[PDB]
Amino acid sequence: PPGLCPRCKKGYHWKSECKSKFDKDGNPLPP
Ligand SMILES: [Zn+2]
Secondary structure, three states: OOOEOOOOOOOEOOOOOOOOOEEHHHEEOOO
């Protein structure tokens, strides 16, 4: 589905589904 992770903004997925290491502002993708 069209859900551009507005958190990391490096892929489409849910925040909780964000499997990225870091996110915007280079934040540590929290659990
Ligand atoms: Zn993400």
